[PDB]
Design a protein around this nucleic acid. Sequence first.
RNA 1: AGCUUUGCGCAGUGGCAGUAUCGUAGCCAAUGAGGUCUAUCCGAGGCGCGAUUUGCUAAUUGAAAACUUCCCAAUA
RNA 2: UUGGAAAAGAUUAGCAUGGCCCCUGCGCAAGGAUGAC
Lengths: 152, 141, 309, 50, 13, 389
Amino acid sequence: VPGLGRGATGFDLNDTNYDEFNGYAGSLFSSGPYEKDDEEADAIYAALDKRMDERRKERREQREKEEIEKYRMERPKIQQQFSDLKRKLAEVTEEEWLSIPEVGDGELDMRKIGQARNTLMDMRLSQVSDSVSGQTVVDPKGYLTDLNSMIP
Amino acid sequence: SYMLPHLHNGWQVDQAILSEEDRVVVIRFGHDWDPTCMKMDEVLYSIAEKVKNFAVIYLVDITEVPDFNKMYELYDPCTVMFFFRNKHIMIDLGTGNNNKINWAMEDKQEMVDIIETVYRGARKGRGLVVSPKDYSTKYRY
Amino acid sequence: VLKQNPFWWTHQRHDGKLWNLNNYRTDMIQALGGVEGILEHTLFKGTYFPTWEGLFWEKASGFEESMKWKKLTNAQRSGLNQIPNRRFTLWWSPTINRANVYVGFQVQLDLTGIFMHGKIPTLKISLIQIFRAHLWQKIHESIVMDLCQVFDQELDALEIETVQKETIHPRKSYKMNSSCADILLFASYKWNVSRPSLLADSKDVMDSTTTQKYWIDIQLRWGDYDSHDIERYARAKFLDYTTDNMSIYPSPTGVLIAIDLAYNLHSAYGNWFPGSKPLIQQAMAKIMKANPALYVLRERIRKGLQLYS
Amino acid sequence: KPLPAPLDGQRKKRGGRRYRKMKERLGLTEIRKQANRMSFGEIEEDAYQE
Amino acid sequence: DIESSLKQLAERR
Amino acid sequence: IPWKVPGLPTPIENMILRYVKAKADWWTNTAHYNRERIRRGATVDKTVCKKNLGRLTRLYLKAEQERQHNYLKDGPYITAEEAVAVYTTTVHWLESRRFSPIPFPPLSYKHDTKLLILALERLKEAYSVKSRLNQSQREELGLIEQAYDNPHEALSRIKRHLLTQRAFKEVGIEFMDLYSHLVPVYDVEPLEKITDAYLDQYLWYEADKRRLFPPWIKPADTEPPPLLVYKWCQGINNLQDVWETSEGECNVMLESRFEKMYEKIDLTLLNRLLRLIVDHNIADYMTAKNNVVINYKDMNHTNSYGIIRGLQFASFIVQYYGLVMDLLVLGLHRASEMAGPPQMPNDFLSFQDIATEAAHPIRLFCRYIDRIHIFFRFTADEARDLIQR
RNA sequence: AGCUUUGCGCAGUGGCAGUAUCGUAGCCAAUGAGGUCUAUCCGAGGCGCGAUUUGCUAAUUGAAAACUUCCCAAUA
RNA sequence: UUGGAAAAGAUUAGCAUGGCCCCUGCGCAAGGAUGAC
């Protein structure tokens, strides 16, 4: 069945297939009367193109290889970066695959020295503050009781 | 990834459009590798289950299914197509053409509102519906 | 606070109000051209309100009592928020729908004589709502029937044998390129006719010719700010249709009355016969004062503008 | 939870009775005048007080 | 299902 | 938050860890790049800014958690002798001022009702009418109106909270997205908000009654910031022969910001300093209110180093702690010359005598919330001695 | 046989109904939910989520707000 | 009788039912006390 079998009517030219330069991608003579003479002509013209490229072929190919090698070495493709873990992931039993759950579910303590220094500083500050006489403080419980008694 | 179901031939498409009677059929024509299609499909997966009650999403590859290219003017790298009870719904986005989105919005709420408006207009009976937003200006400042 | 405060440096209660812009608003009104000068850019004259003193808007009213409290969807909330923009665009249509603002794209409204300069979908929807159910044709029909009734009520006083209901194509009401005849007057005696003059031309020069059949045409227009002069429009269209080739008139002599609905104006420039001047004057007065279709147009405009007295 | 399928049933079939208490809770009889009004002509309070 | 699309994506990219 | 699936095999888990690491690196880099683009002035839409704000919020809370843990590990950054030097400076200043400490809000406080009404009015003012409020805002409004109806029970509850409560609920956080810089915004539980507002009102009223804050501490409530600039310029111009430069005299205008003022406030030293001026129960409550959990959508951490600034009384704390730094910047001598004797205080920019005004290189001092403006006047000999040092 | 009780349902008058009326598929609960009074004392559901059927009539808007061929001229 | 022509249903308001409760009557289940040569 074609697309009209739905009974619908309209209300590679895709922009992807088109480039401002070279126009639309894709050879216009991809298929046609191809025979032994056509193959010979294509071989001759390809040989001519290769001969033309021979002008700087060695240095151009050397620079291309060096550039691509350095580009791959500097920036690795993400698949290359994860290939190591992908290959290390092969060593797994098929029984463990069924076991994958869902998401429904010496050494020094660093806090102790900080607490000790903080307590030392607090003790020093309290020792200094004991010389201060004018500080005021009320009895929390006592004040509260009075509040209690004050409730109408 | 692309957990959204895919249609591999025109037959799958033309019985998928007729499969849903109470839900809006959404078809993304394009290519997975296409980045813009990648953005839209990420947005769709972000809201694939939110609109399960009244909408369905299918992904169609242009290369795999090229029969709709001529009839639907599928010349953009990506298009989004809305159907209901075998009838296409045009959406007035303000972009000039009302038949297809033809662009990838990053905000999933915009697509949710668009599909909700399309459903509301399709169940009521209007073939052309007005987008509850103007996309002529990108609203960038 | 998640809201940024611009007046962070002061408090209204403690420091008082350090600035005053009442005189600024007064000077703004004066410089913009006064109250009436500003209102000329608006559809206030289209509402036919006798005065602007006692009027008032209705902010957040809409067609559904503004439907403020609800479990509404975000898209519906956006539409409700955009409705006041629709009111604002409808209010300022006469000054932004003119060809000076937008060059090109002069498209007439569907089944309506209004031209839309610039693709403003908001104004398009508002005008379609105002002129729903072929309101232009109904307005023109009501005007022509009222004028025929007035002429029949004063038939023998001006030596008119009878009046005639010309077969009018529906589009004629909103046909601007060409025109046709609306009312035909037949006489028992010869009508000496005068040279063309405006509706306000008290002194008219008599033409040295007579006729037996006399045509009356009614043209309704929606003038923008730059072209709201009804007299110039009436004169130009009379001198165009009479000397036109796609417009056929029963007689070279007749009268063309142009009515501006957007500004509630009226003027006639055609050929006149004695005794028709006052009759047409009071006919236009009464038809602007008490036409049913015109009253419906005014009420629809008021509802669209959410303006009440 | 998926967003429920939008639908537009009949808004109201009958009135009075409890319906009134419903609006009373939300949509009760407010002033309904001079609050959503603009007073086209003159200015209340300061010009640009906002 | 998902792997069928993953192979198409990897081949085309 | 920790992520450790028990049944997940370790190769798949390690691949997921690597993927999360790579995506997190890209996420952080693109968030920083987008913030630079937005701050520079590039054209961006709403989604980008919203996303960036979210990313930055997550990144900034990550950094804040790291900073808090670094404070816990590396201990207090202020040395013990440094802290006791600051404490001695503050006690000498307050003794020199004969400052009587602010007592606990008395039960029969004559002005308690007025302060409570002012606090409730301030809290209600913060809720601009939008007609669309969440549960938290409507609950705060309900508590506000309930306290307004019965001031006495609310006052008793507030005093009980000040006397007993030391553990509080999570404080929500959000970021004002000013494109130049993000600004923290803190949402507090409404009962805690009311208690903090009343405490702030009481503290400010009592401090201004006792003249705790010296004149140089602005923003004062008697002059808008433009009037502050005007008074500063006139005071600069009204110094004795300030513009004379025949004998090599030189005037120096220094402006600074007290970098990381709020974040680098030690809560222990802050509590010890607060116990000098206010009741010890009030000081403990103020310090404990800062050591609470700051919570984003899915993120939360215990704020242990820095103050919150979302607290209603934080406005007081910054104006107090900063005053301490003033005594460090000015010295207990020069400040005593500028603040005037406790018998009669001086004005913002005034001295008892001209001989006192020029007796020190520092002529004028003005502290904003955190910025400091200092005007020095040196002779040639003093300037060359300072340059030589 | 007369009389009466508890519980239940039908019918009826009157009353209440957003600090009101329920679902709860989520969880906890007489193997004890929740308790500032009476605490070696009391004894039931509680907490989160989500709701607040049908008929008639009237009115408004609109040209038409839905029940099965309508109109025009003349005589009877 | 005759002649002739041929909003894909909106919006608001009120009453009753339904819901819950006191009481009444009845039905039913299980009983309670008690009268009679």
